Design a protein around this ligand. Structure first.
Ligand SMILES: *Cc1c(COP(=O)(O)O)cnc(C)c1O
Ligand SMILES: *Cc1c(COP(=O)(O)O)cnc(C)c1O
Lengths: 396, 396
């Protein structure tokens, strides 16, 4: 049955790693990794989650099963983080939340609820979007299409070639947005543009699907979600899939949450029951530890004080490396305007290099970027920067 | 889209709980719960996992992502637990292992790999089997059928009406077994009977799918898997989904592993790649903590010494409660032969009560059993026993 019938191929990020330690030169610089790094080139476990973990080791008197929808106050905290303190969605009880194994785990759960208990058959992702977006939605049974977003001659959003590509989307369609800012490009919709997309999706059909992974990483925990919250006020139906892995450092623990707003507490509760029936068929009930850590930090003003500080420290390092990269190019190799790296937001960005400049960097110069020209700027240590630019200036 | 379109209904175990604390009488006795309880009626966190958890809090220097297939030595430990020390499957490299979010998480992963990368379209579960078996396999896209196993006039396996119902299964079919012993009934295939089913599945087609959750709970960590290991020697293709939640007390952490044997290391590796492609579309990468706990206990002879002791202590309590239940019936209410409770294995068993004896127990007498007459015997404290039997003797 499994004999010689089967296949391969490599989901493209993960293929880049093994090919790299492999280099000994040091194999000096790997950019493109999906995770943040500090001053030294390591991803530590936050001091704030570390404190909340001894608090747990001290207080857990049982490891018996979680309800399918997770921890109660974890839910109360994530909706309160997404929508605001007194957002009428919260009470009006228009929103319900299921703790999930990551952002990816929440995207499939949405896609499976949608796939069986609704009329959706197609879903639109940006161009480009996160690699895995396509196989999650496809896997559930849906189809995935592509609106235009950016292109790489002028280094920004085509707000005109975007709205004029989402007009081919019909009433029953899911449009996936990324709330904070965008993987790979790093490019911001302004609240005026969000304002716009918000109002097309009300008088147009379409169910919004926010993909929220870099909260707190562009401008600040409250500012970033103002997009999603611009949308959450026109709308009566919404699904946001959130991750707590990159801004909590909680990556291998698997923590995030699938939340749905749905017009009135009576319906968000019929719709959450089938949503819960889809978790039972999937993983059954969620992973307690890492979510338990996000719930007790966020519900502790001393620990949350310290975590928000670590969140402001992660963000400013990335913001410092964009200027240390843009102008060490400026100052070591004249060729072109790289400006755009600066105020673009988040860890990921598109350098503007050919597939053959990526291949020119990776096999003699050290620098490993993913074939799209997408570099993780958090992967730049202050010591990287002037050999980093070496290769990028030797290739133009 | 979600508006008044949707539905309900309650997956039957979980419905029994809320309906119970609700009783104040104390609402004296809830049996049927899916988890073990001790002398006092609580589910504690094992002293051995508790030690391995401070060891972790001390040594984790990062929470960055796991590979899709989990922890290496966790894999090496679970195959070595399932097959033996020098089982030729292990090296001959005929077996590959993916760490998963629970036993349920591994059953869906199997079912999704199977559903897209194979010719299987139908899968046979026992009668009865675990409630959730049906919706996992259905959810992936497959169909689920029912062989006969037991019936409730003579309180055992119909080894004759079983083999003569699995003859309607064709070559490309998956037959799901439960390696240790059986949920609800508690009824053992003997190695002679396993021997048999082993040899039909070789000269008959059928892919074995072992569902391994109560290892160490019937007779002992090595003895229990001798069924699976009788099967693992005729066979060239196998899938076992294992859980570490009930015998490690690790329930809300979500730890188990989907392992496939598949004839030769070259093919188990083409077949594991598509298996890995299905995890990426599902949860992406697994929950580190609880699996990390199972890997460091099992790879530490001091900690494993203590864990195996806790496993022998959980098992003997259940074995003591079967005799304290069977003969406190004997000694407080003469009506019938309840013998069979004794040597039947595991936590769960079928009392032999009508739906209307379950309803006679639950709303005036205290005792809460699930409508099938399935009682969790681990749910009996030594103090329960003579009011427990009260109700069961008042109903015959
Ligand atoms: C990281 C990320 C995700 C989710 O990943 P998890 O590891 O499951 O949290 C989803 N969407 C985008 C855009 C991401 O960057
Ligand atoms: C408990 C159990 C499972 C799995 O449950 P998890 O909580 O996912 O470990 C699977 N099969 C049977 C028969 C079970 O009893």
């Amino acid at each position: 049955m499994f004999e010689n019938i089967t296949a391969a191929p490599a989901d493209p990020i993960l293929g880049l790693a093994d090919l790299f330690r492999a280099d000994e030169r040091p194999g000096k610089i790997n950019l493109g990794i999906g995770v943040y790094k500090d001053e030294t080139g390591k991803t530590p476990v936050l001091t704030s989650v570390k404190k909340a973990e001894q608090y747990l080791l001290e207080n857990e008197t049982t490891k018996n099963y979680l309800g399918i929808d997770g921890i109660p106050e974890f839910g109360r905290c994530t909706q309160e983080l997404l929508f605001g303190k007194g957002s009428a969605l919260i009470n009006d009880k228009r929103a319900r939340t299921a703790q999930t194994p990551g952002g990816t785990g929440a995207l499939r759960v949405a896609a499976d609820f949608l796939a069986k208990n609704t009329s959706v058959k197609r879903v639109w992702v940006s161009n480009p979007s996160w690699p895995n977006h396509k196989s999650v939605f496809n896997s559930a049974g849906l189809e995935v299409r592509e609106y235009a977003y950016y292109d790489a001659e002028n280094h920004t959003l085509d707000f005109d070639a975007l709205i004029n590509s989402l007009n081919e989307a019909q009433a029953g369609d899911v449009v996936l947005f990324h709330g904070c800012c965008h993987n790979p490009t790093g490019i911001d919709p302004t609240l005026e543009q969000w304002q716009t997309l918000a109002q097309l999706s009300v008088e147009k059909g379409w169910l919004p699907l926010f993909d929220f992974a870099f909260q707190g990483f562009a401008r600040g925990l409250e500012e970033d979600a103002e997009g999603l919250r611009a949308f959450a006020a026109m709308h009566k139906e919404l699904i946001v899939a959130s991750s707590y892995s990159k801004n909590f450092g909680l990556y291998n623990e698997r923590v995030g949450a699938c939340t749905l707003v749905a017009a009135d507490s009576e319906t968000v509760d019929r719709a959450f029951s089938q949503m819960k029936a889809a978790i039972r068929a999937n993983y059954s009930n969620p992973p307690a530890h890492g979510a338990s850590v996000v719930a007790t930090i966020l519900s502790n003003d001393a620990l949350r004080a310290i975590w928000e500080q670590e969140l402001t420290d992660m963000r400013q390092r990335i913001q410092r490396m964009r200027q240390l990269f843009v102008n060490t190019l400026q100052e070591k190799g004249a060729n072109r305007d790289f400006s755009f790296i600066i105020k673009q937001n988040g860890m990921f960005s598109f350098s503007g290099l050919t597939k053959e400049q990526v291949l020119r960097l990776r096999e003699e110069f050290g620098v490993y970027a993913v074939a799209s020209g997408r570099v993780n700027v958090a992967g730049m240590t202050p010591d990287n920067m002037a050999p980093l630019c070496e290769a990028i200036v030797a290739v133009l």
